[PDB]
Structure formats: structure tokens, C-alpha cells
Amino acid sequence: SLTSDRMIDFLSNKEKYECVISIFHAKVAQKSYGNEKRFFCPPPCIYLIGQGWKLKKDRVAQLYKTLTELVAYIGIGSDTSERQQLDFPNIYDYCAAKTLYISDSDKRKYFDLNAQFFYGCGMEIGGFVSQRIKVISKPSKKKQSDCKYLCIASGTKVALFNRLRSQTVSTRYLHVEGNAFHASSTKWGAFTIHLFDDEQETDNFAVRDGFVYYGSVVKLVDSVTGIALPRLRIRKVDKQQVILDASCSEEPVSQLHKCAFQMIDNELVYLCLSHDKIIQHQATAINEHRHQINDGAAWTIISTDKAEYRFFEAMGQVANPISPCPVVGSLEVDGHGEASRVELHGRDFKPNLKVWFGATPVETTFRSEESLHCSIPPVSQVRNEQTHWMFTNRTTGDVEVPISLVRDDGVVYSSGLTFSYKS
């Protein structure tokens, strides 16, 4: 059972002990018909981050020298779809699943991915799910315009990939690596796509809201690094040809569309791939409304998502799997005085969890899996002389506390949320 003090060593040393697992995937997948397989692309993948993973391995090592290599499997939550084995500085380990697919025998409109982790000795770490993924029959072809799920809104995340005659073997992905955009055969970037506005360059720019349409000027920005491509205009492609019809401005960019990115200064110059390098390619005109491009200039755009989980076995290493990790959506502060309750919303709340406003625990109850009403601790009892420096703001002067859920096991799940003592 987590004692008031071991918490303090953790909150002060978050990144030393906290295990982080992140699952990146697209929001959509194309169904497979008959006996065929259309692989989820970009490949769903898992990043293990934090040094906590090294200390987890250390614990299991000591534990099993008295009684090795960690393996993981991923599936789509159906018992006729075989689970598949995942092959493997802040990043501990990485694996992608390149041959996942879903067949038309499965009738679900939505599914999720479930990855389970084990050590080679056989101790289950646990199972983690991705976000909702929508099954699509085929990339949409709507020219106009209800749904909106298949559109791409300004300020959301996208992957960009490139097939080569739908056959050599390869597919490559837009990815920034060491300050440069490249085209990776194994890793893919989640980029924020922005609708560029007006005021012509560069580092600091204005953006509008709205859905992205063909013909719009767009900015691609790396999640991780903050590195951006030059401002580009998005164009639909129809095999090897860029389309330029004015009417395309009425056409929404959509999941799994073939598309191209023309330089703004030069209509014939397109964002293009050469092996793993990102280059500017000059096209040849066919038409007032049509350009011939290389295969490397035809991209495929898809919205993506991420599921992140954080835990640390704060006391000992635990016998049970650390799954299912809870996740917290938001806070709701109703009523005033001391007797005022604060509620939490999210997923996989279990009966065996206690809310920790900081180093101190608090009175908690338990409604269900997606709700958790609890008392707030009297303002006095949250800081002292072991907590104070981490708890009082150095700007406002007001007290701001990190919220945690901790299992009786001893494992703490840092919520990512910190509460602001204002109410």
C-alpha cells in the first residue's frame, strides 16, 4: 500500500520511475473482401518511453533470479482474427504491426486494437487498447459538402505515406528524424495539418479553423519536434496526375485520398520522395488543369490518433498485471465549503483505486467504470515542508496540485491532470 512518502519520491522524480506506453494508429481502416488482406497503414505502432521501463526490467530480473526478453501481441478484438506478434534516448523500445487487417466477415462499424505485453519468463505486464477505429469500405469520392468523420479539420493529426506502383514491397512514411523530414520505411510522423491564413513566411504564421479542401494552403507541423514543412497547397491526385479544376475547392480532403503538395511560389514543384529523402520535384504540364508527377510525389493522407498510458509500481513490483489502466477525461467541481465534491470522468475506473490530490490521499467512493465522485481534502492538509516547492505556483502564488489515481497494489497512474486551487 502506497505510503504518503514514497509518493513524494515519485512526484519529484516523475521521469525516473514512470512507465509510459503509447499506441499510435489511424482513425480509419479499409475493410478486406473475400480472401484478400489490406493492411492497416500506417502500421499501428507502440512506443515504450521513460526510464521506468529499465527499472521494471531490473525488478523482474532480481525477482526471477530467485525463482527476460519482453514480447507483445496485437489484435482487433475478434476471435477468428489471429493475434499477431510485435517485433522490436527517452524511447526504451519500439514495434510496429505491418500486417494487421480486418475482413468483411466482421460486421462491426468500429473496433479497437488491443496490445498485450509479457516478459519472456511469462509475467504478464498487461493489455492496452487504442482509440476507436472506423471500418471503411473504400476511400470516399464525394465532390461536395451530416457525417464529417471522414474529413480533416484544421489543427488535427495526419500521417502521410507513399506507395510505389502499389508494388515493389515498399511503402514509406513522412517522418522527421534529426531536424529533417525524411521518408521512413519503419516509422511515421503524426503531423498537425493547419489551414494557413494571411498577413510571406515563415517561422511564425496565422491559421484558420475549418475543414481542409483541395486547393487550400496548408501547413504540416511535427508533433514531437515542432519542425514544419514550407507552406503547401493540397491537390487531389488521380493516378500519376495532379488535378487542378477550380471545382476541387468544393472537394473536402478525406481519409485515404491520394494527394499532392505543390510549392506556393512554383506551381510545377511538388513535395516528393527519393528513397528516404524528402525533395522538391518539378512536374510536367499536360493541361491547364493537369500535371504529370513521379510516383514519389503521390501521397496518401489519413487522420491519426494516439493512446497513452502511464503507471509506476510505486511500492514493490506487483504480482498482478498493471492493466487495466484508468484514464481521466475531466473534472467537475460542484458545491462549495469543505463538503464540496469533485467528480472524475473517464474509462476503466475499478473499485480498487484512490484519488491522490498530491502526496496526501483523499476520501473516494466509486460509482462505476466511467465515473468516480470524491471529496476534496481541506486546503491546509495538502502542502507542508516536504511538499510546498512542487505545490505552490512560482507565478500566481495559488496552489496547484497534481492529481493521481493509485491502486492498492502500490502502482500509481499519474492522470496528466493538475488541479487549480481557486474555486
Binding site: N204, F205, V207, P230, S274, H281, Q282
Partner: peptide, 13 residues
């Protein structure tokens, strides 16, 4: 809204 981002210019073919 305003966003900051170092621009990476791709080389030329």
C-alpha cells in the same frame, strides 16, 4: 491563432 515552427526546406531533386 498563431503558431511557431522552424521551417525545413527540402533540397532540389
Amino acid at each position: 491563432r498563431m503558431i511557431n515552427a522552424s521551417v525545413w526546406m527540402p533540397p532540389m531533386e
